[PDB]
């Protein structure tokens, strides 16, 4: 499932802004 | 009317915009309590104002680090804009000052923690829960944009939940006052409109795209475009093919297809009817916009508040000594702060 893919991804933590 | 409210709002804003408050407190007036969050060039701390006993969030920015990251002008934008605006869902800047080493922005403390925290823990919000928060962003963006301001960093990490369960938008680091278009590649990957990524030059319509991303993420529990690395995220955004969970209502999908619209001549928020294409969309049929602004609607979720200056709704961060050099740093660059 997409949810499972998200949860296993490296970007479920706080996401930093880019400059 | 809305137009009348906005016209008056603009008049107040321009006065402060043209004459910004400056040097309105000093470090020694605050007792430092706890780090609530961190950023590339500083930290936000819970502090207590000694003379009133009030609690505030003090954003401390290291001048030298701001300079190294080429965020001088963005930082000046942030403070100048933040000190000037006034909207129910915008966090209030109470004081600002600087010393030899740092810039300081002392803001209202929002005890309920980040939407990010609650969203991740719970998984996803129901459509009515997501609609409640979304409406507040719709109005906030209507307000900001009427002031020629682009917010440019919408994400759950920047939306705090207050004691009544309403949203407070924080982090104006990328906010900018601009008539027409701008070009700075800034923001957070998941939330960037295609036109930002493509260096096309862009306007307020990027905030309406970002809204589309926020509503999707709130309702699905994950963003419409994610991957392990930013470059992969951009490829997904640019193609713009969006798949919706099977639990998304027909109205929700229709709204999202109009917000996550690559075609600027078709993106909701950006058309002749402006924000009204959104306010009047079927998904918002049950939304009473005035009740929202008035904070009369019952919130789907009220944060637990164990007391004054309690931090239970925030993550723990490593504490560092706030050091102030005996020499002034970067005085010229931040003279206007
Ligand atoms: N988006 C990265 C967080 C960014 C930022 O501005 N955070 N603000 C948090 C804040 C404001 C008012 C509150 O009452 C509460 Br509680 C929290 C940042 C932080 C440190 C340095 C640079 C940017």
Residues B229 and A12: beta-carbon distance below 8 Å: no
Tell me the C-alpha distance between B239 and B221, whole Å.
21
Structure tokens at B149: 């301001």
Residue B162 is a catalytic residue: no
Question: Would you give the distance in Å from CA B102 to the centre of its chain?
Answer: 22
Partners of B186 on chain A (C-beta within 8 Å) are 17-19
Would you give the DSSP letter of residue B21?
A: -
Q: Whose CA is nearest to atom 11 of ligand 1?
A: B170
Pairing status of strand B42-49 against strand B55-62: antiparallel
Consecutive H or E run containing B184: none
Rounded distance between C-alpha atoms, residue B298 and residue B214, angstroms: 21
At residue B49, the 3 state secondary structure works out as strand
- CA nearest to A1 within chain B: B245
Of the candidates B6, B52, B10, B61, the residue with the CA atom closest to the CA atom of residue B31: B52
- Round to whole Å and give the CA distance between B67 and B69: 5
Domains of chain B, each with CATH number or no CATH: 2-19+114-304 (1.10.510.10), 20-113+305-335 (3.30.200.20)
Q: Which of the residues B153, B162, B207, B277 is marked catalytic?
A: B153
Report the atom number in ligand 1 closest to the C-alpha of B42: 21
The pairing of beta strand B149-150 with beta strand B176-177: antiparallel
Largest alpha-carbon pair distance within chain B? 62
Residue B296 — left, alpha, or beta (φ > 0 → left; ψ -120 to 50 → alpha)? alpha
φ/ψ bin of B59: left (φ > 0), alpha (ψ from -120 to 50), beta (otherwise): beta
- CA pair distance B107, B226, nearest whole angstrom: 32
Resolution stated for this PDB structure, in Å: 2.0
The alpha-carbon gap from A7 to the nearest alpha carbon of chain B, in Å, equals 8
Q: Do residue A14 and residue B186 have CB atoms under 8 angstroms apart?
A: no
**Long-range pairs for B250-254 at CB < 8 Å and ≥24 separation?**
B251/B281, B251/B282, B251/B283, B251/B285, B252/B127, B252/B215, B252/B219, B252/B283, B254/B281, B254/B282, B254/B283
Distance CA B9, CA B266 (A): 29
Technique used by the depositors: X-ray
User: Using the beta-carbon criterion (under 8 Å), do B226 and A18 form an inter-chain contact?
Assistant: no
Find, among B144, A9, B89, the residue nearest to B222 by Cα. A9
The reply to whether A1 touches chain B by the CB within 8 Å rule is no
Residue owning the nearest CA to atom 8 of ligand 1: B171
Q: What is the DSSP string of B129-168?
A: HHHHHHHHHHHHHHHHHHTTEE----SGGGEEE-TTS-EE
Chain B environment of A15 (Cβ under 8 Å) = 155, 157, 188-190
Task: Quote the distance between the C-alpha of residue B196 and its chain's center.
Answer: 18
What residue has token string 């209202």?
Answer: B108
Q: Is B37 in the pocket of ligand 1 (CB under 6 A)?
A: yes
Return the ligand 1 atom nearest residue B314 CA.
Answer: 16
Helices (H), chain B: 2-18, 63-68, 72-82, 115-122, 127-146, 194-197, 205-220, 230-239, 250-259, 276-279, 289-293
A chain contacts of residue B116, beta-carbon cutoff 8 Å: 14
Distance CA B191, CA B189 (A): 5
What is the B39 CA–ligand 1 centroid distance (Å)?
7
For strand B93-98 and strand B167-169, is the pairing parallel, antiparallel, or unpaired?
unpaired
Q: A9, B220: Cβ pair inside 8 Å?
A: no
């Amino acid at each position: 499932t997409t949810y499972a893919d998200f949860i296993a991804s490296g970007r479920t933590g706080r996401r930093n802004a880019i400059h | 009317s809305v137009k009348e409210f906005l016209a008056k709002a603009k008049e107040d804003f321009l006065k402060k915009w043209e004459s910004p408050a400056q040097n309105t407190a000093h470090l020694d007036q605050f007792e430092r309590i706890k780090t609530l969050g961190t950023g590339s060039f500083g930290r936000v701390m819970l502090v207590k104002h000694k003379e009133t006993g009030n609690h505030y969030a003090m954003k401390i920015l290291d001048k030298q680090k701001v300079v190294k990251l080429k965020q001088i002008e963005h930082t000046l934008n942030e403070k100048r804009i933040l000190q000037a605006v006034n909207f129910p869902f915008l966090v209030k800047l109470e004081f600002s000052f600087k010393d030899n080493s740092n810039l300081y922005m002392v803001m209202e403390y929002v005890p309920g923690g980040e939407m990010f925290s609650h969203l991740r823990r719970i998984g996803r919000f129901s459509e009515p829960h997501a609609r409640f928060y979304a409406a507040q962003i719709v109005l906030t963006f209507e307000y900001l944009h009427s002031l020629d301001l682009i917010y440019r960093d919408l994400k759950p990490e920047n939306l705090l939940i207050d004691q009544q369960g309403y949203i407070q938008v924080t982090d104006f680091g990328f906010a900018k006052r601009v008539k027409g278009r701008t070009w700075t590649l800034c923001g957070t990957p998941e939330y960037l409109a295609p036109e930002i990524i493509l260096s096309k030059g862009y306007n307020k319509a990027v905030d309406w795209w970002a809204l589309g991303v926020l509503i999707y993420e709130m309702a699905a529990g994950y963003p419409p475009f994610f991957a392990d690395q930013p470059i992969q995220i951009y490829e997904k955004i640019v193609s713009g093919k969006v798949r919706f969970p099977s639990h998304f209502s027909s109205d929700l999908k229709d709204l999202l297809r109009n917000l996550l619209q690559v075609d600027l001549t078709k993106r909701f928020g950006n058309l002749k009817n402006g924000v009204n294409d959104i306010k009047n969309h079927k998904w918002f049929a049950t939304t009473d916009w005035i009740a929202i602004y008035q904070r009369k609607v019952e919130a789907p979720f009220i944060p637990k508040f164990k007391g004054p200056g309690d931090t239970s709704n925030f993550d723990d961060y490593e504490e560092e000594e706030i050091r102030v050099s005996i020499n002034e740093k970067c005085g010229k660059e931040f003279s206007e702060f």
